Amino acid sequence: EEVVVEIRIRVQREEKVRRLIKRILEEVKRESNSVEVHVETRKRNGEVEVHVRIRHDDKETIERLVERILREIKKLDKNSEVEVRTTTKR
């Protein structure tokens, strides 16, 4: 069964969105080329939300990639608000 992870990142200022998306896509590239990733930016009332959806068959790969993404998010902005939603079939 496939694992789907959705990561929502609340960014303070829109100027930091480009580096954040670039860093996240770089970590996905370093993991494997079989990992499916989609990125979506949402702007409401001067605030930006970055939505990352990742699909993969191996839960070990998914959990390793998520933790590495969360560490890279924290290095770019210590006060980043992140919500992670993981969907699995059993």
mmCIF file of N, CA, C and O in Angstrom:
data_model
loop_
_atom_site.group_PDB
_atom_site.id
_atom_site.type_symbol
_atom_site.label_atom_id
_atom_site.label_comp_id
_atom_site.label_asym_id
_atom_site.label_seq_id
_atom_site.Cartn_x
_atom_site.Cartn_y
_atom_site.Cartn_z
ATOM 1 N N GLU A 1 0.826 -1.202 0.000
ATOM 2 C CA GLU A 1 0.000 0.000 0.000
ATOM 3 C C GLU A 1 0.865 1.257 0.000
ATOM 4 O O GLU A 1 1.957 1.270 0.567
ATOM 5 N N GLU A 2 0.370 2.314 -0.637
ATOM 6 C CA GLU A 2 1.107 3.563 -0.735
ATOM 7 C C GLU A 2 0.873 4.423 0.501
ATOM 8 O O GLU A 2 -0.168 4.336 1.158
ATOM 9 N N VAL A 3 1.862 5.256 0.814
ATOM 10 C CA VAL A 3 1.781 6.216 1.908
ATOM 11 C C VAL A 3 1.698 7.611 1.306
ATOM 12 O O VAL A 3 2.461 7.944 0.392
ATOM 13 N N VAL A 4 0.772 8.421 1.813
ATOM 14 C CA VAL A 4 0.610 9.805 1.386
ATOM 15 C C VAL A 4 0.860 10.704 2.586
ATOM 16 O O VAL A 4 0.252 10.515 3.646
ATOM 17 N N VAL A 5 1.755 11.675 2.423
ATOM 18 C CA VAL A 5 2.068 12.644 3.465
ATOM 19 C C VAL A 5 1.806 14.037 2.918
ATOM 20 O O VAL A 5 2.264 14.375 1.819
ATOM 21 N N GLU A 6 1.070 14.839 3.680
ATOM 22 C CA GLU A 6 0.779 16.221 3.327
ATOM 23 C C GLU A 6 1.367 17.127 4.397
ATOM 24 O O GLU A 6 1.049 16.982 5.581
ATOM 25 N N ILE A 7 2.228 18.049 3.980
ATOM 26 C CA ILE A 7 2.924 18.952 4.888
ATOM 27 C C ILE A 7 2.464 20.371 4.592
ATOM 28 O O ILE A 7 2.544 20.828 3.446
ATOM 29 N N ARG A 8 1.979 21.062 5.619
ATOM 30 C CA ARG A 8 1.532 22.444 5.505
ATOM 31 C C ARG A 8 2.469 23.323 6.320
ATOM 32 O O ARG A 8 2.646 23.095 7.521
ATOM 33 N N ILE A 9 3.061 24.322 5.672
ATOM 34 C CA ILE A 9 4.047 25.195 6.295
ATOM 35 C C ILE A 9 3.523 26.623 6.238
ATOM 36 O O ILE A 9 3.250 27.147 5.151
ATOM 37 N N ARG A 10 3.390 27.250 7.403
ATOM 38 C CA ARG A 10 3.004 28.655 7.490
ATOM 39 C C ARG A 10 4.267 29.507 7.453
ATOM 40 O O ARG A 10 5.091 29.449 8.372
ATOM 41 N N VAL A 11 4.421 30.291 6.390
ATOM 42 C CA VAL A 11 5.595 31.134 6.191
ATOM 43 C C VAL A 11 5.243 32.561 6.583
ATOM 44 O O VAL A 11 4.160 33.061 6.253
ATOM 45 N N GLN A 12 6.162 33.221 7.291
ATOM 46 C CA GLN A 12 5.904 34.574 7.776
ATOM 47 C C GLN A 12 5.779 35.559 6.619
ATOM 48 O O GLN A 12 4.751 36.228 6.464
ATOM 49 N N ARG A 13 6.816 35.660 5.794
ATOM 50 C CA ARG A 13 6.844 36.595 4.679
ATOM 51 C C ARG A 13 7.046 35.841 3.372
ATOM 52 O O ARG A 13 7.783 34.851 3.321
ATOM 53 N N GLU A 14 6.382 36.321 2.317
ATOM 54 C CA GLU A 14 6.408 35.644 1.026
ATOM 55 C C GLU A 14 7.807 35.589 0.423
ATOM 56 O O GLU A 14 8.068 34.736 -0.433
ATOM 57 N N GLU A 15 8.714 36.468 0.856
ATOM 58 C CA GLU A 15 10.057 36.506 0.289
ATOM 59 C C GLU A 15 10.853 35.238 0.574
ATOM 60 O O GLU A 15 11.800 34.941 -0.162
ATOM 61 N N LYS A 16 10.497 34.488 1.614
ATOM 62 C CA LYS A 16 11.217 33.275 1.979
ATOM 63 C C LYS A 16 10.634 32.016 1.349
ATOM 64 O O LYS A 16 11.141 30.921 1.613
ATOM 65 N N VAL A 17 9.594 32.141 0.523
ATOM 66 C CA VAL A 17 8.929 30.960 -0.020
ATOM 67 C C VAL A 17 9.814 30.258 -1.043
ATOM 68 O O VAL A 17 9.879 29.022 -1.083
ATOM 69 N N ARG A 18 10.508 31.028 -1.883
ATOM 70 C CA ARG A 18 11.297 30.439 -2.962
ATOM 71 C C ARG A 18 12.397 29.534 -2.417
ATOM 72 O O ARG A 18 12.590 28.413 -2.902
ATOM 73 N N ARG A 19 13.134 30.008 -1.409
ATOM 74 C CA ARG A 19 14.196 29.191 -0.828
ATOM 75 C C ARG A 19 13.629 27.961 -0.133
ATOM 76 O O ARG A 19 14.228 26.880 -0.181
ATOM 77 N N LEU A 20 12.476 28.106 0.522
ATOM 78 C CA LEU A 20 11.870 26.976 1.220
ATOM 79 C C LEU A 20 11.476 25.875 0.244
ATOM 80 O O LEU A 20 11.766 24.694 0.471
ATOM 81 N N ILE A 21 10.812 26.243 -0.854
ATOM 82 C CA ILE A 21 10.402 25.251 -1.844
ATOM 83 C C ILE A 21 11.620 24.606 -2.492
ATOM 84 O O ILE A 21 11.648 23.392 -2.726
ATOM 85 N N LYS A 22 12.647 25.405 -2.789
ATOM 86 C CA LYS A 22 13.855 24.857 -3.397
ATOM 87 C C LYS A 22 14.523 23.844 -2.477
ATOM 88 O O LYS A 22 14.953 22.775 -2.926
ATOM 89 N N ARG A 23 14.609 24.158 -1.183
ATOM 90 C CA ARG A 23 15.246 23.246 -0.239
ATOM 91 C C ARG A 23 14.457 21.949 -0.098
ATOM 92 O O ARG A 23 15.045 20.866 0.002
ATOM 93 N N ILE A 24 13.125 22.037 -0.091
ATOM 94 C CA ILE A 24 12.301 20.843 0.069
ATOM 95 C C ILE A 24 12.412 19.948 -1.157
ATOM 96 O O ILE A 24 12.538 18.722 -1.039
ATOM 97 N N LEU A 25 12.365 20.539 -2.354
ATOM 98 C CA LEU A 25 12.502 19.745 -3.569
ATOM 99 C C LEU A 25 13.889 19.127 -3.679
ATOM 100 O O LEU A 25 14.045 18.053 -4.272
ATOM 101 N N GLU A 26 14.905 19.788 -3.121
ATOM 102 C CA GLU A 26 16.248 19.222 -3.134
ATOM 103 C C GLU A 26 16.332 17.987 -2.248
ATOM 104 O O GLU A 26 16.992 17.005 -2.606
ATOM 105 N N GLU A 27 15.668 18.015 -1.091
ATOM 106 C CA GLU A 27 15.682 16.850 -0.212
ATOM 107 C C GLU A 27 14.909 15.687 -0.821
ATOM 108 O O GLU A 27 15.288 14.524 -0.644
ATOM 109 N N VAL A 28 13.822 15.979 -1.538
ATOM 110 C CA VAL A 28 13.092 14.923 -2.233
ATOM 111 C C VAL A 28 13.953 14.322 -3.336
ATOM 112 O O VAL A 28 13.953 13.104 -3.551
ATOM 113 N N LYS A 29 14.706 15.166 -4.046
ATOM 114 C CA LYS A 29 15.592 14.681 -5.099
ATOM 115 C C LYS A 29 16.711 13.817 -4.529
ATOM 116 O O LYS A 29 17.099 12.813 -5.137
ATOM 117 N N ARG A 30 17.242 14.192 -3.362
ATOM 118 C CA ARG A 30 18.319 13.418 -2.754
ATOM 119 C C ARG A 30 17.838 12.050 -2.289
ATOM 120 O O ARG A 30 18.616 11.090 -2.290
ATOM 121 N N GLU A 31 16.570 11.941 -1.892
ATOM 122 C CA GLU A 31 16.045 10.663 -1.420
ATOM 123 C C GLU A 31 15.968 9.650 -2.556
ATOM 124 O O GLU A 31 16.658 8.624 -2.538
ATOM 125 N N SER A 32 15.138 9.926 -3.558
ATOM 126 C CA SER A 32 14.983 9.037 -4.702
ATOM 127 C C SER A 32 14.214 9.772 -5.788
ATOM 128 O O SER A 32 13.483 10.729 -5.517
ATOM 129 N N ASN A 33 14.390 9.311 -7.027
ATOM 130 C CA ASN A 33 13.622 9.833 -8.149
ATOM 131 C C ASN A 33 12.264 9.161 -8.296
ATOM 132 O O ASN A 33 11.450 9.617 -9.106
ATOM 133 N N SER A 34 12.005 8.092 -7.542
ATOM 134 C CA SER A 34 10.706 7.435 -7.553
ATOM 135 C C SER A 34 9.687 8.131 -6.662
ATOM 136 O O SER A 34 8.501 7.787 -6.717
ATOM 137 N N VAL A 35 10.116 9.094 -5.853
ATOM 138 C CA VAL A 35 9.222 9.784 -4.931
ATOM 139 C C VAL A 35 8.417 10.826 -5.695
ATOM 140 O O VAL A 35 8.980 11.695 -6.371
ATOM 141 N N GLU A 36 7.094 10.743 -5.586
ATOM 142 C CA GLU A 36 6.193 11.698 -6.216
ATOM 143 C C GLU A 36 5.950 12.864 -5.264
ATOM 144 O O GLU A 36 5.612 12.656 -4.095
ATOM 145 N N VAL A 37 6.131 14.086 -5.760
ATOM 146 C CA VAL A 37 6.004 15.281 -4.932
ATOM 147 C C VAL A 37 5.244 16.351 -5.706
ATOM 148 O O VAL A 37 5.438 16.519 -6.914
ATOM 149 N N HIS A 38 4.359 17.059 -5.006
ATOM 150 C CA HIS A 38 3.644 18.206 -5.547
ATOM 151 C C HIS A 38 3.674 19.327 -4.520
ATOM 152 O O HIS A 38 3.487 19.087 -3.324
ATOM 153 N N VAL A 39 3.910 20.550 -4.989
ATOM 154 C CA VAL A 39 4.037 21.718 -4.128
ATOM 155 C C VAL A 39 2.997 22.749 -4.543
ATOM 156 O O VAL A 39 2.811 23.010 -5.737
ATOM 157 N N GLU A 40 2.323 23.334 -3.554
ATOM 158 C CA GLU A 40 1.298 24.341 -3.793
ATOM 159 C C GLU A 40 1.445 25.467 -2.780
ATOM 160 O O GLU A 40 1.595 25.215 -1.582
ATOM 161 N N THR A 41 1.426 26.704 -3.268
ATOM 162 C CA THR A 41 1.493 27.883 -2.418
ATOM 163 C C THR A 41 0.118 28.527 -2.330
ATOM 164 O O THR A 41 -0.584 28.655 -3.337
ATOM 165 N N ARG A 42 -0.264 28.922 -1.120
ATOM 166 C CA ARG A 42 -1.545 29.569 -0.869
ATOM 167 C C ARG A 42 -1.310 30.863 -0.106
ATOM 168 O O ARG A 42 -0.651 30.859 0.939
ATOM 169 N N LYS A 43 -1.851 31.965 -0.621
ATOM 170 C CA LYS A 43 -1.687 33.279 -0.009
ATOM 171 C C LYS A 43 -3.043 33.800 0.439
ATOM 172 O O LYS A 43 -3.936 34.008 -0.390
ATOM 173 N N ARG A 44 -3.195 34.012 1.745
ATOM 174 C CA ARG A 44 -4.372 34.654 2.312
ATOM 175 C C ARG A 44 -3.925 35.792 3.214
ATOM 176 O O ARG A 44 -3.136 35.574 4.139
ATOM 177 N N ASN A 45 -4.433 36.995 2.946
ATOM 178 C CA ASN A 45 -4.276 38.146 3.835
ATOM 179 C C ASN A 45 -2.814 38.373 4.219
ATOM 180 O O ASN A 45 -2.465 38.490 5.395
ATOM 181 N N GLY A 46 -1.949 38.432 3.208
ATOM 182 C CA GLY A 46 -0.542 38.692 3.434
ATOM 183 C C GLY A 46 0.251 37.550 4.030
ATOM 184 O O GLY A 46 1.452 37.715 4.271
ATOM 185 N N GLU A 47 -0.371 36.403 4.281
ATOM 186 C CA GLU A 47 0.317 35.230 4.797
ATOM 187 C C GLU A 47 0.355 34.146 3.728
ATOM 188 O O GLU A 47 -0.555 34.035 2.902
ATOM 189 N N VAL A 48 1.416 33.344 3.749
ATOM 190 C CA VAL A 48 1.647 32.315 2.743
ATOM 191 C C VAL A 48 1.686 30.954 3.423
ATOM 192 O O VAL A 48 2.358 30.784 4.447
ATOM 193 N N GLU A 49 0.966 29.992 2.852
ATOM 194 C CA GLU A 49 1.040 28.594 3.253
ATOM 195 C C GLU A 49 1.633 27.781 2.112
ATOM 196 O O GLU A 49 1.181 27.889 0.967
ATOM 197 N N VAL A 50 2.644 26.973 2.423
ATOM 198 C CA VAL A 50 3.251 26.061 1.460
ATOM 199 C C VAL A 50 2.746 24.657 1.752
ATOM 200 O O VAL A 50 2.906 24.152 2.869
ATOM 201 N N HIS A 51 2.131 24.030 0.754
ATOM 202 C CA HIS A 51 1.578 22.687 0.881
ATOM 203 C C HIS A 51 2.417 21.730 0.048
ATOM 204 O O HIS A 51 2.580 21.934 -1.160
ATOM 205 N N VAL A 52 2.943 20.692 0.693
ATOM 206 C CA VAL A 52 3.757 19.674 0.038
ATOM 207 C C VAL A 52 3.056 18.336 0.206
ATOM 208 O O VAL A 52 2.786 17.911 1.336
ATOM 209 N N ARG A 53 2.763 17.673 -0.909
ATOM 210 C CA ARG A 53 2.182 16.338 -0.896
ATOM 211 C C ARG A 53 3.175 15.353 -1.495
ATOM 212 O O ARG A 53 3.694 15.576 -2.594
ATOM 213 N N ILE A 54 3.439 14.271 -0.767
ATOM 214 C CA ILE A 54 4.424 13.268 -1.154
ATOM 215 C C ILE A 54 3.757 11.902 -1.125
ATOM 216 O O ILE A 54 3.090 11.555 -0.144
ATOM 217 N N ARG A 55 3.934 11.130 -2.196
ATOM 218 C CA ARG A 55 3.382 9.786 -2.302
ATOM 219 C C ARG A 55 4.509 8.794 -2.552
ATOM 220 O O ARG A 55 5.387 9.045 -3.385
ATOM 221 N N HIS A 56 4.482 7.673 -1.832
ATOM 222 C CA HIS A 56 5.488 6.633 -2.001
ATOM 223 C C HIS A 56 4.949 5.328 -1.434
ATOM 224 O O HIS A 56 4.012 5.318 -0.630
ATOM 225 N N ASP A 57 5.564 4.226 -1.864
ATOM 226 C CA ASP A 57 5.160 2.899 -1.415
ATOM 227 C C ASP A 57 5.858 2.460 -0.133
ATOM 228 O O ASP A 57 5.284 1.679 0.637
ATOM 229 N N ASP A 58 7.076 2.941 0.117
ATOM 230 C CA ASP A 58 7.885 2.504 1.252
ATOM 231 C C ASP A 58 7.720 3.493 2.401
ATOM 232 O O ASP A 58 8.120 4.657 2.291
ATOM 233 N N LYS A 59 7.139 3.023 3.509
ATOM 234 C CA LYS A 59 6.927 3.893 4.663
ATOM 235 C C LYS A 59 8.245 4.314 5.303
ATOM 236 O O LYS A 59 8.337 5.418 5.852
ATOM 237 N N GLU A 60 9.269 3.460 5.241
ATOM 238 C CA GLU A 60 10.577 3.830 5.775
ATOM 239 C C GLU A 60 11.155 5.019 5.018
ATOM 240 O O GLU A 60 11.691 5.956 5.622
ATOM 241 N N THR A 61 11.062 4.992 3.686
ATOM 242 C CA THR A 61 11.495 6.131 2.883
ATOM 243 C C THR A 61 10.689 7.378 3.221
ATOM 244 O O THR A 61 11.246 8.476 3.340
ATOM 245 N N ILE A 62 9.375 7.221 3.394
ATOM 246 C CA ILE A 62 8.507 8.359 3.682
ATOM 247 C C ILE A 62 8.889 9.001 5.011
ATOM 248 O O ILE A 62 9.040 10.224 5.107
ATOM 249 N N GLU A 63 9.061 8.185 6.054
ATOM 250 C CA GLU A 63 9.363 8.738 7.372
ATOM 251 C C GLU A 63 10.740 9.388 7.399
ATOM 252 O O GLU A 63 10.931 10.422 8.050
ATOM 253 N N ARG A 64 11.713 8.798 6.700
ATOM 254 C CA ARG A 64 13.042 9.397 6.638
ATOM 255 C C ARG A 64 13.011 10.728 5.897
ATOM 256 O O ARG A 64 13.645 11.701 6.323
ATOM 257 N N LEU A 65 12.268 10.792 4.790
ATOM 258 C CA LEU A 65 12.203 12.022 4.008
ATOM 259 C C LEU A 65 11.466 13.123 4.760
ATOM 260 O O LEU A 65 11.847 14.297 4.683
ATOM 261 N N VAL A 66 10.411 12.765 5.496
ATOM 262 C CA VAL A 66 9.641 13.765 6.234
ATOM 263 C C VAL A 66 10.497 14.402 7.323
ATOM 264 O O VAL A 66 10.516 15.628 7.486
ATOM 265 N N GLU A 67 11.224 13.578 8.083
ATOM 266 C CA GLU A 67 12.060 14.112 9.155
ATOM 267 C C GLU A 67 13.163 15.006 8.606
ATOM 268 O O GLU A 67 13.521 16.015 9.225
ATOM 269 N N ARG A 68 13.716 14.653 7.446
ATOM 270 C CA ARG A 68 14.757 15.482 6.850
ATOM 271 C C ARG A 68 14.183 16.802 6.349
ATOM 272 O O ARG A 68 14.825 17.852 6.472
ATOM 273 N N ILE A 69 12.970 16.767 5.793
ATOM 274 C CA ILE A 69 12.306 17.994 5.362
ATOM 275 C C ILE A 69 12.025 18.895 6.557
ATOM 276 O O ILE A 69 12.247 20.111 6.504
ATOM 277 N N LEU A 70 11.546 18.314 7.661
ATOM 278 C CA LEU A 70 11.236 19.116 8.840
ATOM 279 C C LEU A 70 12.489 19.775 9.406
ATOM 280 O O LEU A 70 12.433 20.911 9.890
ATOM 281 N N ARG A 71 13.629 19.080 9.354
ATOM 282 C CA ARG A 71 14.877 19.678 9.825
ATOM 283 C C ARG A 71 15.306 20.832 8.925
ATOM 284 O O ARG A 71 15.779 21.866 9.415
ATOM 285 N N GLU A 72 15.148 20.674 7.612
ATOM 286 C CA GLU A 72 15.509 21.750 6.696
ATOM 287 C C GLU A 72 14.571 22.941 6.836
ATOM 288 O O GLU A 72 15.000 24.090 6.676
ATOM 289 N N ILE A 73 13.294 22.689 7.133
ATOM 290 C CA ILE A 73 12.358 23.782 7.383
ATOM 291 C C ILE A 73 12.781 24.570 8.615
ATOM 292 O O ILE A 73 12.742 25.807 8.625
ATOM 293 N N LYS A 74 13.204 23.868 9.668
ATOM 294 C CA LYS A 74 13.579 24.541 10.906
ATOM 295 C C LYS A 74 14.862 25.346 10.743
ATOM 296 O O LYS A 74 15.024 26.386 11.392
ATOM 297 N N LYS A 75 15.779 24.889 9.887
ATOM 298 C CA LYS A 75 17.005 25.644 9.649
ATOM 299 C C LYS A 75 16.729 26.945 8.907
ATOM 300 O O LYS A 75 17.413 27.948 9.142
ATOM 301 N N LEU A 76 15.736 26.953 8.015
ATOM 302 C CA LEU A 76 15.396 28.178 7.298
ATOM 303 C C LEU A 76 14.628 29.145 8.190
ATOM 304 O O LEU A 76 14.822 30.363 8.104
ATOM 305 N N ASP A 77 13.756 28.624 9.049
ATOM 306 C CA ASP A 77 12.966 29.461 9.948
ATOM 307 C C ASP A 77 12.655 28.641 11.192
ATOM 308 O O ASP A 77 11.905 27.663 11.120
ATOM 309 N N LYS A 78 13.232 29.046 12.325
ATOM 310 C CA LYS A 78 13.033 28.318 13.574
ATOM 311 C C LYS A 78 11.578 28.357 14.028
ATOM 312 O O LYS A 78 11.084 27.384 14.610
ATOM 313 N N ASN A 79 10.875 29.456 13.758
ATOM 314 C CA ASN A 79 9.506 29.643 14.217
ATOM 315 C C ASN A 79 8.466 29.191 13.195
ATOM 316 O O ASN A 79 7.313 29.634 13.264
ATOM 317 N N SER A 80 8.839 28.323 12.259
ATOM 318 C CA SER A 80 7.894 27.865 11.249
ATOM 319 C C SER A 80 6.839 26.957 11.868
ATOM 320 O O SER A 80 7.160 26.030 12.618
ATOM 321 N N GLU A 81 5.577 27.230 11.549
ATOM 322 C CA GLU A 81 4.460 26.389 11.959
ATOM 323 C C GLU A 81 4.232 25.339 10.876
ATOM 324 O O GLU A 81 3.952 25.684 9.723
ATOM 325 N N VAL A 82 4.354 24.067 11.252
ATOM 326 C CA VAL A 82 4.259 22.950 10.321
ATOM 327 C C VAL A 82 3.208 21.972 10.825
ATOM 328 O O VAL A 82 3.161 21.656 12.019
ATOM 329 N N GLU A 83 2.364 21.495 9.914
ATOM 330 C CA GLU A 83 1.388 20.454 10.210
ATOM 331 C C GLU A 83 1.598 19.313 9.227
ATOM 332 O O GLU A 83 1.705 19.545 8.018
ATOM 333 N N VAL A 84 1.661 18.088 9.742
ATOM 334 C CA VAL A 84 1.948 16.906 8.937
ATOM 335 C C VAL A 84 0.762 15.960 9.026
ATOM 336 O O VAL A 84 0.315 15.619 10.128
ATOM 337 N N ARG A 85 0.261 15.533 7.869
ATOM 338 C CA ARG A 85 -0.844 14.586 7.788
ATOM 339 C C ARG A 85 -0.390 13.391 6.964
ATOM 340 O O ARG A 85 0.003 13.551 5.804
ATOM 341 N N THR A 86 -0.441 12.204 7.562
ATOM 342 C CA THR A 86 0.035 10.978 6.933
ATOM 343 C C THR A 86 -1.122 10.000 6.798
ATOM 344 O O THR A 86 -1.815 9.719 7.779
ATOM 345 N N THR A 87 -1.321 9.476 5.590
ATOM 346 C CA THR A 87 -2.421 8.564 5.305
ATOM 347 C C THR A 87 -1.862 7.222 4.859
ATOM 348 O O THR A 87 -1.066 7.159 3.916
ATOM 349 N N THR A 88 -2.278 6.153 5.536
ATOM 350 C CA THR A 88 -1.842 4.802 5.216
ATOM 351 C C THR A 88 -3.049 3.876 5.137
ATOM 352 O O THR A 88 -4.088 4.130 5.752
ATOM 353 N N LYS A 89 -2.903 2.800 4.367
ATOM 354 C CA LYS A 89 -3.902 1.745 4.282
ATOM 355 C C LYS A 89 -3.379 0.495 4.975
ATOM 356 O O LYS A 89 -2.216 0.117 4.799
ATOM 357 N N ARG A 90 -4.237 -0.137 5.769
ATOM 358 C CA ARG A 90 -3.835 -1.294 6.556
ATOM 359 C C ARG A 90 -4.704 -2.497 6.212
ATOM 360 O O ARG A 90 -5.732 -2.358 5.547
#
